[PDB]
Amino acid sequence: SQSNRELVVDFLSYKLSQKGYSWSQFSIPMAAVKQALREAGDEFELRYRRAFSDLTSQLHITPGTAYQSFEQVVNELFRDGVNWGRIVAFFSFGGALCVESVDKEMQVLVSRIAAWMATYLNDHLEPWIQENGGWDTFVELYGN
Numbered sequence: 644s645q646s647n648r649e650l651v652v653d654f655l656s657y658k659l660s661q662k663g664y665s666w667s668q669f670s671i672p673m674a675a676v677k678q679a680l681r682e683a684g685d686e687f688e689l690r691y692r693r694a695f696s697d698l699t700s701q702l703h704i705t706p707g708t709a710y711q712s713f714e715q716v717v718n719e720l721f722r723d724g725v726n727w728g729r730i731v732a733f734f735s736f737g738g739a740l741c742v743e744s745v746d747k748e749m750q751v752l753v754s755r756i757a758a759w760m761a762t763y764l765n766d767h768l769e770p771w772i773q774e775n776g777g778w779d780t781f782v783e784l785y786g787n
């Protein structure tokens with residue numbers, strides 16, 4: 644999808660803005676999915692992410708690191724399969740890897756992390772999203 648590409652892009656830009664970094668590595672129901680996912684991600688970071696294993700601990704992200712490394716770590720969010728919260732967490736996770744990377748002046752890694760997210764979302768998560776009524780059902784379940 645291209646739709647999903649802009650979600651990842653929307654999410655990462657919001658998060659970089661929010662946490663105080665440049666988001667300029669990045670140059671209706673869709674504004675509505677964006678919002679719902681934005682807020683979802685904030686609620687997950689606020690209330691919940693504290694409980695989980697730091698998956699950022701299990702991926703010292705560096706210029707050498709490739710998609711399989713990424714994939715293998717995100718796979719830990721989905722050993723029991725996909726659900727909406729785990730998808731929210733997946734976006735959280737990416738945002739996190741963007742904050743660390745800019746915090747590590749590797750600002751260029753960002754767009755690549757966004758590449759990986761769009762690949763991972765599209766290869767593994769999409770089959771579930773569609774089965775479960777797509778993003779419009781997420782919004783209905785997590786709006787406001």
Ligand SMILES: C/C(=N\Nc1nc2ccccc2s1)c1ccc(-c2cccc(S(=O)(=O)NC(=O)CCCCCc3ccccc3)c2)o1
Pocket residue numbers: 692695696697698699719720721726727728729730731732733735736737739
């Ligand atoms: C380890 C991990 N995440 N780690 C992360 N690290 C970072 C760092 C930065 C940003 C995001 C993350 S996410 C992980 C695995 C699964 C999930 C997850 C994410 C979102 C939602 C959910 S959830 O909604 O599906 N909830 C759970 O999985 C917990 C439910 C536990 C029920 C246990 C139970 C047993 C028997 C009877 C009743 C209940 C899981 O996170």
